[model samples]
Target: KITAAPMVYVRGEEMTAYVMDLIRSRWIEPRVDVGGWETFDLRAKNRDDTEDRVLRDVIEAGKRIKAIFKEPTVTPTADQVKRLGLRKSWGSPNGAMRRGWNGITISRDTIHIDGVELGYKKPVLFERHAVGGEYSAGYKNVGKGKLTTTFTPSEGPDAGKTVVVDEREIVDEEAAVVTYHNPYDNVHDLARFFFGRCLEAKVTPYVVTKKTVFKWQEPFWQIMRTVFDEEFKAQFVAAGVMKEGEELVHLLSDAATMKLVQWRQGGFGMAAHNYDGDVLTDELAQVHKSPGFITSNLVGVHEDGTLIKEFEASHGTVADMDEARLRGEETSLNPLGMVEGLIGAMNHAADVHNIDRDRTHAFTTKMRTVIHQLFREGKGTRDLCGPSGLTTEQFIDAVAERL
Candidate 1:
């Protein structure tokens, strides 16, 4: 009886509908909150809803809801604008929500499915800086112009300590420029979050950066090292999570990539700055076999200094399956990631609200156990070579039967 809200998108609507059916069958109550490009367009057009209002509502709901589970959503393009009759193409709700909640860390981990030798068995978890850096920085492509990043203290004592981080005189017409900055506090928080997970999982920790090339990236390494030495080193040693000489390790981002790909022991955790995390996580997801097995959680501090965590499936809404459903064609949709997200949310809700903790934990454990068993028995979705396997509904039923 854990309380939760699901923000479902158009392509994932059918899968979510099936999931809700399973929830009803088990008598687990959940609130369905509409979100996605289509929904956003309709709201903006029909109700004249302001983006700020909608975004604020999402944040408010997050504050009240103990846990939230989200399906993948679309950030529309030009064609979608005409199709949806939107007032304007809005930015991604995912981005808006993360910013609103001040979520700064994105954690993605591999999942284990039976009978499928993914060739990699490591439980490598990626800790990503969820905000700032290249993502929000200004970008421009210019002809015969100068590129510069300037920092000016508008009111501080060192108001004139303004300095240029980077500047290039672009003579080429095709020259492009982008600027990014990471706050010291944000980097500090990333170290804390990454080490916290390492302690919990009892694994060695690594931080990745390209300090050799991008000297500014040295801050990432420096901050992580300082935080690890001052705040986490003692705790990590006491918990036997790290050895004295190998307490924490740093690797050039590229070297770390090669090692992770070749890694088989799978007993370590890692943290990366914003852009690297965004790119590498997807690559790792593919290597781990299907985005369907990826689980994502955003961890960050709110303006009020309260920590917030939100769980979601790492994959996008199944556009192909949604098309199939529209054509009255049968389709097998892998629900593992979404189910994991849902269960994760429920477990968080249970812990936060002190409601049905045991039941939620049992349900989560049972769901994972049964889903893995199904995959092991060659009864999973088509993605896992289950012979064009179970329909979305059928898969849920299979899990329900096991439960």
Candidate 2:
């Protein structure tokens, strides 16, 4: 259950949130892995505190646990550590003893090699090189010989017959779209949020995508899936779950319509990629009766296949809630989404069922009961779709007493 995260800068909003989710929140990654994730909240503690020797102990503990639990064991290699962009100094005190000059270290994340499985198993590898691009005048154009490096082929059929070769795949198309500062960051968050659920349910959250068409948008998912398979597969399967590829569910068509029917009916926990998620979330949102009643999670998953953090609530900056506050007209904007987010975070920190099943069950029961009471009270927030409303405060007070 112990979760580990890289050292974080306190000033950065995204990094700070990601750090907390990785360490202290279990509900955050239930879909990612099924046994439940637990964190010590190391990222929230002040990095500069001299008493921070405690954190080093936690980090070392994480490494030791990783060594003991994960099968086909995965940890960072010295070279891969460099690729991960971790500070060589390790920054914290115990960092030295764990990954120091004389210390032995392993990869901290999963590794994947392109052209290895497909090419070797299928025995079909293409030798073509791709032309990289640079933005100019807000548009991209393919330029030839941009990366002209004359090198010798180590071994190839043509190596004996031919000493050298030139290859290129030309791409001249340009893409345009609206972008947020951290688009991929958001993707990472949501992936982690869902992946944690998989871990909790003892199911794999496969991402259904047609990368064959929307190559650029969906490549990120492929990378995420690969990392999980290479690094966490054994631990996952040991828990009685199979990799997504091993699941016959992977045979389903790429269409979202078909995937959803297969997941809910066929019993799978796979995630829909950005476009599919956008569509499916709305579909799922309807089940809540209104988007107002549903919550959307913007979660971050790490390169190491760890849950990094979470942000929740489908309800936006409620102009109505704000307006009501001004008029002394107290209104109960349903707190269901927010409460669920917190509950999700707590579950991610540690499995309530393992620590105290009755407590977990009771707490969840109270939450659901309070929700029922809300509708019974009739003073609840108006259901945007209709009159069935749950008086919000009644639920909160009910939950508050139990907590």
Highest-scoring model, lDDT:
1
Q: How would you encode candidate 1's per-residue C-alpha lDDT over 1-403 as one tens digit per residue?
A: 3333233121234444445446545434332212211212213233224744655555666655535666555455556568657666665566666666777688888777646777457577789888877667777878997677788887879897988867879989787687767755787878887888888887788888888897877888888999999988988888987667665688888887787777766767889887888777887888788776768987756566656667778876565676787898887877778777767766666676566577668867877898889888777877785665787677767777776
User: What's model 1's overall lDDT?
Assistant: 0.69
Q: Which ten residues in a row have the lowest lDDT in candidate 1?
A: 33-42
RMSD after CA superposition, every candidate: 4.3, 15.8
**TM-score of each model, paired residue for residue:** 0.83, 0.39
Put down candidate 2 lDDT per residue, 187-296, tens digits, no spaces. 34344444454556565455555556645545456545655666555656777767435632332224655544333322244454334444555544443243434443
Off by over 4 Å in 2: 1-206, 215-247, 250-254, 257-268, 292-307, 328-330, 346-369, 372-381, 384-403
Instruction: Assess each prediction's global lDDT (C-alpha) against the native.
Output: 0.69, 0.36
Candidate 1, superposed: residue stretches over 4 Å from native = 1-53, 64-66, 82-87, 114-116, 146-149, 154-157, 164-167, 231-242
**For model 1, which pairs clash?**
122-266
At residue 63, what lDDT does model 2 achieve?
Answer: 39
Report how far residue 43 has shifted in candidate 1, in Å.
9.7
**Candidate 2 at 343: error in angstroms?**
2.4
Q: Cα deviation in Å at residue 353, candidate 1?
A: 3.2
